[PDB]
Amino acid sequence: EPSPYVEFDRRQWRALRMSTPLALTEEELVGLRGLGEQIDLLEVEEVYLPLARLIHLQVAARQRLFAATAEFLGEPQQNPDRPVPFIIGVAGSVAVGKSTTARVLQALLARWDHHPRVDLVTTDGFLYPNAELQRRNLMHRKGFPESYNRRALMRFVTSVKSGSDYACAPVYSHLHYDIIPGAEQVVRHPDILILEGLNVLQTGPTLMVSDLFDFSLYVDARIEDIEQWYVSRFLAMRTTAFADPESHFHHYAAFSDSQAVVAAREIWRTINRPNLVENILPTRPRATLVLRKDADHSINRLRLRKL
C-alpha cells in the first residue's frame, strides 16, 4: 500500500549528507544547546546537515512556483535582491528540544555560501499578556491555541512572506512570564524565516500560518519521555532560571526534589500534556519532516513527506 511518507533510520539519513560542510564549532553549538539537550557535533553532521541540504534544494525549486505565478500574471519578473521569504515551521511539545532544533537550524542555514538573512521567531511574543489571559480565564492555558493572538501572528507572517521591508512581533519574557511592554522584534525581509511554536502547524476555518509554510519540522518523542525531560528540566531550573530573585517562579527554587517533581507533574498533567494530546500531536501528520527523538534525546528515526 502506497504512502505519502518515507521512513529513515539515522544510517540512511546521514548518507544524504553528500559533501555538505559543517560550519559550526563546539563552543557555538554549546551556545545554542538548551538545558537537557544532548546534541553533539556528530548529530549535527548526520541529521542536521542532510536537512540543510534538502532545504536549500527546496528553496531553489519552490522559487519557481512564485516565478510561474509572476509570469502568468504578466508581472515584472521578480527582483533578485528580494526573493520570496522561505518559511519554515518548527513544531512540537514543550520540553522536546524543538527550540534547540530551531536554533541549530538557523545557525547552519545562516552559514550557507551566500550567507542568507535567516531570522528565528518563536510564537511566545504572540501570547496574550497575562492581564488579557486572566480576563479570558486562560491563565492556566498558556500554550493552548486560544492563548495566542492568532490574527496578529498570521498578520506578521503574511507581511514577511508578502515581501514587506519590515514586520514586528511582540516580545515575551520567560523571566517575568509575560509580554514585555513596548518590546518589538523587527524582521527585515529575511531570505529564510523560521517560525517556532507549539501549534503553528494547526489548520482551520481560515488561512493560518501553517498554510504559508514552505517546509515544516515536527520534533517528536514518546510522551512518557517528554514528561521525564519536562520534570527533569523543572528540577534543574531551581538553580538556573528560578534561582534569579527577579524570576516569577523564584519560589520554586526552594522546593525539594519531591516537591519539585509533584509540582512539575501537576503542571504537565493539567496544561502541557493535554495541549500536546489534543492540539499539538494531531498536527504531526502534515509535517514535511518529523525528527524522532529516543529516550536519550538522540534522533534515530526520521519521517519525510514525499507527497
Ligand X SMILES: CC(C)(CO)[C@@H](O)C(=O)NCCC(=O)O
- Annotated binding-site members for ATP: 92-99
126 touches 170 (CB < 8 A): yes
Instruction: Report the interface residues with ligand ACP, using CB under 6 A.
Output: 34, 36-37, 94-100, 174, 241
With CA atoms as reference, report the closest residue to 209 among 167, 268, 180, 270. 167
d(CA 148, CA 153): 8
Question: Does residue 186 interact with its own copies by CB under 8 A?
Answer: no
E-only strand ranges, the chain: 5-9, 86-92, 118-122, 167-173, 178-187, 192-196, 215-221, 289-293, 299-305
Rounded to 5 degrees, φ, ψ at 59 are: -65, -30
Q: Considering the complex, state which of residue 52 and residue 94 has its C-beta at the smaller distance from ligand ACP.
A: 94
Instruction: Specify the residue for cell string 529564510.
Output: 192
Task: State the minimum distance, in angstroms, from the CB of residue 211 to Na ion.
Answer: 7
Angle between the N-to-C axes of helices 223-236 and 257-267, in degrees from 0 to 180, rounded to the nearest 10: 130
Which lies closer to its own copies via its Cβ, residue 37 or residue 191? Answer: 191
Question: Shortest CA distance to 91 belongs to which of 82, 102, 105?
Answer: 102
**Looking at beta carbons only, is 65 or 168 nearer to its own copies?**
65
Interface residue with its own copies among 130, 173, 185, 203 (CB under 8 A) is: 203
When asked if residue 245 is in the footprint of its own copies (CB under 8 A), the reply is no
Whichever of 189 and 216 has its CB closer to ligand ACP, that residue is 216
Q: How far is the CB of 222 from its own copies (least distance, A)?
A: 19
Bridge partners (DSSP) of residue 118 are: 192
Q: How many residues of this chain bind its own copies (CB under 8 A)?
A: 43
Site membership for its own copies, residue 21 (CB under 8 A): no
Strand, coil or helix: 270: helix
Picked from ligand ACP, Na ion, its own copies, none, the partner binding residue 95 (CB below 5 to 8 A depending on kind) is: ligand ACP
Q: Which is nearer to its own copies, 203 or 298 (CB)?
A: 203
By CB under 6 A, name the binding residues for ligand X.
94-95, 230, 233-234, 237, 249, 267
Binding residues: 92-99
Chain centroid offset of residue 190 CA: 17
CB of residue 305 to Na ion, shortest distance in Å: 7
Residues with Cβ within 8 Å of residue 71, at least 6 apart in sequence: 77
Closest residue to Na ion in the complex (CB): 188
Q: Of the candidates 32, 50, 123, 229, which one interacts with its own copies according to CB under 8 A?
A: 50
- Of the candidate spans 127-135, 187-195, 206-214, 234-242, the one that interacts with its own copies by CB under 8 A turns out to be 206-214
Q: Which residues contact 254 (CB under 8 A, 6 or more apart)?
A: 238
In the complex, least distance from residue 268 CB atom to ligand X, rounded to whole angstroms: 8
Contact 105, 88 (CB under 8 A): yes
Per CB under 8 A, does 69 bind its own copies? yes
Q: At what angle do helices 49-72 and 98-110 cross, to 10 degrees?
A: 70
110 touches its own copies by CB under 8 A:
no
Nearer to ligand ACP, 151 or 174 (CB): 174
Which of 9, 15, 42, 295 is in the footprint of its own copies by CB under 8 A? Answer: 15
